[PDB]
Amino acid sequence: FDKLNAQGYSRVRVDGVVHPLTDPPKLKKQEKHDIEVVVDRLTVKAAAKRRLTDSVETALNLADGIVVLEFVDHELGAPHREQRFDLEPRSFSFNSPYGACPECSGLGI
Amino acid sequence: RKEVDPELVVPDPDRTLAQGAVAPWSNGHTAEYFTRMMAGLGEALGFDVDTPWRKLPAKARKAILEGADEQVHVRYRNRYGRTRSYYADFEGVLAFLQRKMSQTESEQMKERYEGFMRDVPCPV
Amino acid sequence: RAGGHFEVVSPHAPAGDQPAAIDELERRINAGERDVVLLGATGTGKSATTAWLIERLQRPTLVMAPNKTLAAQLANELREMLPHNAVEYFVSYYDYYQPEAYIAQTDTYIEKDSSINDDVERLRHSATSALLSRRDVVVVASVSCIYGLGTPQSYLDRSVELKVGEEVPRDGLLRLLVDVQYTRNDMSFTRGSFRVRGDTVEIIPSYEELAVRIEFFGDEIEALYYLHPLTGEVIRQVDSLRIFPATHYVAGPERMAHAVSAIEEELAERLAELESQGKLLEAQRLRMRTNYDIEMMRQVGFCSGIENYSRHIDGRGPGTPPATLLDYFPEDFLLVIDESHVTVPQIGGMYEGDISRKRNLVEYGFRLPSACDNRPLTWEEFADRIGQTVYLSATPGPYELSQTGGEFVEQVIRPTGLVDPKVVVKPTKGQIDDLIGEIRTRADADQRVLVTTLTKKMAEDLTDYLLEMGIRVRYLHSEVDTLRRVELLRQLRLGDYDVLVGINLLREGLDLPEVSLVAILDADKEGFLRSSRSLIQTIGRAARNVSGEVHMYADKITDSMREAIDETERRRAKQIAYNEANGIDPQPL
Amino acid sequence: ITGAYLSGRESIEIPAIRRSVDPRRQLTVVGAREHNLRGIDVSFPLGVLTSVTGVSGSGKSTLVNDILAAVLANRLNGARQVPGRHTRVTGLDYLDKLVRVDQSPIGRTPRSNPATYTGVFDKIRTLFAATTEAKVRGYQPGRFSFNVKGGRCEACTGDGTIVPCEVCQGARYNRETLEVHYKGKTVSEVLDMSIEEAAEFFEPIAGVHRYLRTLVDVGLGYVRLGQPAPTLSGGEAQRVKLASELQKRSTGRTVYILDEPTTGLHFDDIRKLLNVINGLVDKGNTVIVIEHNLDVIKTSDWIIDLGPEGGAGGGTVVAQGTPEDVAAVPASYTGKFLAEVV
């Protein structure tokens, strides 16, 4: 977080609570955190894309392509409108055991 | 590892030695990086730094092939601005290049330079 | 433009005639006379008295310096003496310099080639920002300030104010920042560039070293703070701030259009002149260079050698004085020139040489006559433009004395306890044995002796002879570079030798606390570079020591040297009489 | 072009001065006992269009390229090649720089382009970032490349056309970067525009002007800046650089080692190249060229034949002088070829 403050973000969301980056809360090696830090304090506006892009695209280079638009409000009725930015690539093969029946060795029934 | 021909590292008996007779002595930045202690060893042994090897005997070429043991104090800056300290003992260019193969971080040249002018075939 | 207070920390206590000099200067300067000359020798605290006049006048001040060695020292001392007020520094931002000259006798054409620095242009832009942000500002500058520059009003028009909780669109702020030459660089954060991260923007000015976060909330500034760019240590926080351009030649687009039209006029005139002269190759080279530069900063804005077209930015006609740093100061400002005895003659000689090389360029197809107009200020236009002019030097300059009618103020007396050297005059011949005996007797103190000659041949003959009989000697030549005598300074502070010899490379920043005896050899002969000022300069160099001595050898005696010796002796007598009453030991603070 | 060679009016002897050679200002090589050589003395003149010829594999390449070009490259510009088996090169005080251009069939990867390896694309990005819009949008020259992840959209995957990218619509630039309309054009617009009509562009700015002007001097301004190497025919990969690799320090005796333009370009293209060579040799340049044709080296002023017979039957100089001089000698087949047609 000291390095993050040196870079400059002014936002953070850790341990389930949102803070400015200048305010680091308590952290422990035995404590588990779902770290989902904040990057900005913007909101929806007309013709504000040039703003919101600058909030997300650079984050795409730091969060490894992870960014959401969560409620950060009280009611939390829907789970953040399922808004985030079962599927698996795996590998393509038929004779190889990469993608065949692991038990029957890919042979016919 | 039979290669083409030995003596190919310094096969010139008439060039100006101060003008980089040996290929590592003529690099973009490593040129001076090796010329420093190689001229130091030339001054120590007693063969000239620029005179062609025909006014001098061929013993100059032979003694730059075999060189001598021990090390001397040496350090210089290159054109690129870096500062490398090649502090090692080399027995002439034949073992100096072998030291380059066994020491350098350039995994390409450490086998590029072996082929043209080093002949160490399988004895067994 | 708001007048502040010159909060000066002065732990040094004024002694004796210093207040008398200060209020004499006040009484002279309040009369409104355009010509003022002050005699302040080396070591007399000229910086302190100049700063005191600055405090009393409460006006922006411009200090005129002839070289980097004096200018940098004056700048750092003046910064130290004024904590709160933004003391400044303004010199050419080039370490290596090669002027574009054309020697016709040897047909040698030396082009524009330099070595850009990074720690001096930031100080220049700090100077401009402080000058046009607060009235209580002091700026010390070298001759590069009298070269081409931008107008103060146009550059001030681009300074933009900001505050916490104000209506400021991000797009407009970024456009204004880029228009004042701040390229938005994100991954790399360096001076002249700013980065953006989320709703925050990290900005670094062209004058300050610490970064600043400007945090927004929609189309409105949320807050502003300072931070260290690397360590991240919080210092302070402010509500309002102002931003300034990162180059000195910023103005409105219509001024760019007018400058372009003036460039077209100048290039047409030069092309016609070169076509009449028949110098096709030189005209072609000049035309390609001008097309390149003019088109590429018409499309971008930044180039090399834009100063040649600075006149076109200034809106002034040919032959008029180019806009300089004194225009930045208002008409109610104070200017002072330091070391004027070698600064004003330097101004004249440098203007002559630059105008000769500029004729050799423009006439022989290298630059437009606008480059001739882009020059150090000529003395006629200098007098036409300056106001209450104050001079300051170790010796009374003949030009200053003629301008002032001979009436001056003398403050060369040192309360610190410095006296002029003793004088011994001997014939040119029969001196080497005496010099050897004196150096053998004096070498127990391990000091240094400076000697001079006329030209190189017998000088080097003396050097190798005097290293032959058993003394370590060092010599100076006509092409002395910085390293070869900075190492001399290092090894003399290491005490590695005892004697230096030099002809002309001795008047520029070669200060040494342990030089007692100086020898002048056959300098009585006429010379454009060996008149009385060099002898008085060496006399003062010996004087700065606790106990100086000059050994002066002449075949013939001229009036200049004897009048200089007489005035030096009478000033030394006055200083001794003053110091006999001020017997307190020096107390530096 | 092949017909234009025979009915030339341009592939003629074109008699030069041939006296710009100098008895002292001249390079020599002796004692080269290479496996392909014998140890003969080759006398290279300076300030001329000297051409080294002979049967390939008889030692001409091992002497001119493996020995000479190697030594002047490694200790006259800063290269790394081994000198090889020889003894002497003279005129060290009369030489300043050397440039070697190989045959080099190297165009196979889409990454390599006639503007990317030449070192001009980075300067193009710098110039485009010098625009106000690129400054306000925070786009840097490195950001403004097409190989780094910053400037390439994931939809194209970097190739521009996959049916092209839906977002780019056949332009190979994302919308967040295409907004930079410097001089009314973008990078895609400049790349699409042909160099022949772009000769008026980049005229003020010096380096791109020099590159484009020398490319046009070659006469093949049909290529685009970002042309992928799979679409470039083998042989012309280094021609574009070789255009700018023929005038350094304007002395201009700086020696340039030339490959064979016969590989690829036909004799009319080689005669346009010859016009360029002759013009800048009159300016003062020096070229050492291994060649295969007849009239192109007949235009030259000095011919050196190394080895009449292939293999071990060569390795020795058999002629050195004016092309008509070697033509009169019934020993070098190069001269014999230059003699049957005059």
Ligand SMILES: [Zn+2]
């Ligand atoms: Zn795309």
